[PDB]
RNA sequence: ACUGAAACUGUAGUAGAACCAAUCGGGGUCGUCAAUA
């Protein structure tokens, strides 16, 4: 049998910038991200991390709740996250372009 | 004198912390000008 899954839950939306952004990348500030493709992109590890963080401090760093939701590589119970959080292109709107502060 | 079979290199990890695009500056005011014959 695969991992034993009760509900699949797709949970889908939209996520706009309320400031600018800035998500940077290997290749001073002026990489930002980009998937293969080069375009602008949230990297799932980034916007896991961000909402993990959260999460994490919602439940006072109770790390079991937080690793039952978002897995563990140590405990042998645990394994892989439930959650999976995948890449999202950045729709920079139309007569804009990145900027520099 | 007879091919082993079957097995996901995966699992967890926020490219981030810090840094004022800033410092100084009255939109002001008076003596000529020209070189020959």
């Given at each position: 049998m695969a991992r034993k899954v009760t509900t699949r839950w797709k949970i889908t939306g939209t996520?706009?910038?309320e400031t600018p952004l800035h998500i940077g990348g290997v290749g001073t500030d002026l990489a930002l991200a980009v998937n293969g493709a080069g375009?602008?992109?949230?990297?799932?590890?980034?916007?896991?991390?961000?909402?993990?963080?959260?999460?994490?401090?919602?439940?006072?760093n109770d790390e079991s709740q937080i690793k039952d939701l978002w897995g563990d590589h140590l405990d042998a119970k645990r394994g892989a996250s439930f959650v999976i959080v995948d890449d999202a292109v950045i729709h920079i709107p139309n007569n804009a372009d990145v900027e520099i502060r």
């Open positions: 996520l706009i910038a375009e602008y992109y949230v990297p799932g590890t980034s916007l896991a991390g961000a909402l993990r963080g959260w999460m994490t401090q919602l439940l006072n």
